């Protein structure tokens, strides 16, 4: 691959991200003064654990749906076999969501945009997973200190997804080739924009892995307490990704075959 091709991959990735970023950055920035009042915070804290879990699962499912479309438009992704497309999304869709989330996080007051306004960690106290919430806020706080541009988020989240080390890949060498090209595009862009200083400050892969593992652990705790809530009121795509034995849902298969 030559230089003009690396730059074409840079613009192709940024275009696929812009078309699938879910929320406009300007919309998120303009709403920073719109913060939940103490009464609205109390209202969220008074909601039942199962209602807050349901609402968060819905917002999570919607964010994952945009990540799936990002993948479908990502150069090289649809060339991979369907098994590998599903392996990469099952392991990586949530990690992409957690990175994208830093756009909706305000490090000045430690709040995140949620259901129309900004609120702190205390907004989510009814979930009963305070340790995971604090880890998510800490992760978004760490990414916010980097002051990512939109192009940087695009190239970085493409690499989060195209990981040739995910277990279960059948065409590992093909994913390796795509990952190498996307790394070149990412690094070429950082070199051109004099932003290579962020490479040492990107979080280690173990941080994203720990966040996703905590998600599975806290979901199993909740599913034990409210199994009918999960079965009847959680979205099917959410259950295919995090719950078990819920992998029986074909949702990802159908989202990839549409368009």
Residue choice 31, 142, 144, 220 for contact with Na ion (CB under 5 A): 144
Helix (H, G, I), strand (E, B) or coil at 118: strand
Residues 169 and 83: their CA atoms lie apart, in Å, by 7
Residue nearest to ligand 927 (CB): 56
Residue choice 36, 118, 124, 156 for contact with ligand 927 (CB under 6 A): 124
Closer residue to Na ion, CB minimum distance, 28 or 56: 28
CA distances from 19 to 14, 154, 173, 257 (A): 9, 11, 28, 19
Residue found under tokens 């106290």: 125
Closer residue to ligand 927, CB minimum distance, 12 or 214: 214
Alpha-carbon dihedral angle through residues 207, 209, 215, 217, given to the nearest 10 degrees = -110
- Which of 161-175 are b and which e, b meaning 16 or more Cβ less than 10 Å from the residue's Cβ? bbbbebeebeeeebb
Residue 118 binds to ligand 927 (criterion: CB under 6 A) = no
Which among ligand 927, Na ion, none contacts residue 56 (Cβ within 5 to 8 A by kind)?
A: ligand 927
- Which of 188-212 are b and which e, b meaning 16 or more Cβ less than 10 Å from the residue's Cβ? bbbeeeebeeeeeebeeeeebeebb
Residue 105 binds to Na ion (criterion: CB under 5 A) = yes
Smallest distance from ligand 927 to CB 79, Å: 26
The token duo for 9 is 């991959």
Residue choice 6, 7, 22, 184 for contact with ligand 927 (CB under 6 A): 22
Residue 189 binds to ligand 927 (criterion: CB under 6 A) = no
Residue found under tokens 């305070």: 130
Smallest distance from ligand 927 to CB 40, Å: 15
Q: Phi and psi dihedrals of 17, rounded to 5?
A: -70, -45
Residue 215 binds to ligand 927 (criterion: CB under 6 A) = yes
Residue 142 binds to Na ion (criterion: CB under 5 A) = no
Binding mask 23-52 for ligand 927 (x = CB under 6 A): x-----------------------------
Closer residue to ligand 927, CB minimum distance, 18 or 205: 18
Q: Decide: 175 and 88 in contact? Cβ < 8 Å.
A: yes
Binding mask 43-82 for Na ion (x = CB under 5 A): ----------------------------------------
Closer residue to ligand 927, CB minimum distance, 57 or 91: 57
DSSP state of 167: T
Residues 236 and 232: their CA atoms lie apart, in Å, by 10
Binding site residues, ligand 927, CB under 6 A: 21-23, 56-57, 59-60, 63, 97, 100-101, 103-104, 112, 114, 124, 129, 132-133, 136, 215, 218-219, 242
Binding site residues, Na ion, CB under 5 A: 102, 105, 144
């Amino acid at each position: 691959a030559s230089l003009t091709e690396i730059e074409h991959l840079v613009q192709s990735v940024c275009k696929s991200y812009r078309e699938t970023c879910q929320l406009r950055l300007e919309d998120l920035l303009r709403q920073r003064s719109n913060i939940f009042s103490r009464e609205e915070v109390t209202g969220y804290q008074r909601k039942s654990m199962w209602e807050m879990w349901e609402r968060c699962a819905h917002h999570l499912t919607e964010a994952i749906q945009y990540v799936v479309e990002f993948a479908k438009r990502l150069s090289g992704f649809m060339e991979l076999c369907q098994n590998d497309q599903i392996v990469l999304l099952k392991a990586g869709a949530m990690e992409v969501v957690l990175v994208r989330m830093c756009r909706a996080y305000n490090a000045d007051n430690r709040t995140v945009f949620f259901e129309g306004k900004y609120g702190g960690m205390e907004l989510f106290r009814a979930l009963g997973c305070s340790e995971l919430i604090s880890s998510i806020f800490d992760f978004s706080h760490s990414l916010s200190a980097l002051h990512f541009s939109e192009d940087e988020i695009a190239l970085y989240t493409a690499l989060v997804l195209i990981n040739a080390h995910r277990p279960g890949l059948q065409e590992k060498r093909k994913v390796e080739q795509l990952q190498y090209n996307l790394e070149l595009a990412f690094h070429h862009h950082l070199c051109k924009t004099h932003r290579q200083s962020i490479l040492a400050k990107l979080p280690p892969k173990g941080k994203l892995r720990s966040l996703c593992s905590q998600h599975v652990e806290r979901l199993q705790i909740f599913q034990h307490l409210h199994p009918i809530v999960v079965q009847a009121a959680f979205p099917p795509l959410y259950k295919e990704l995090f719950s078990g034995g819920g992998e029986k849902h074909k949702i990802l298969h159908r989202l990839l075959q549409d368009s």
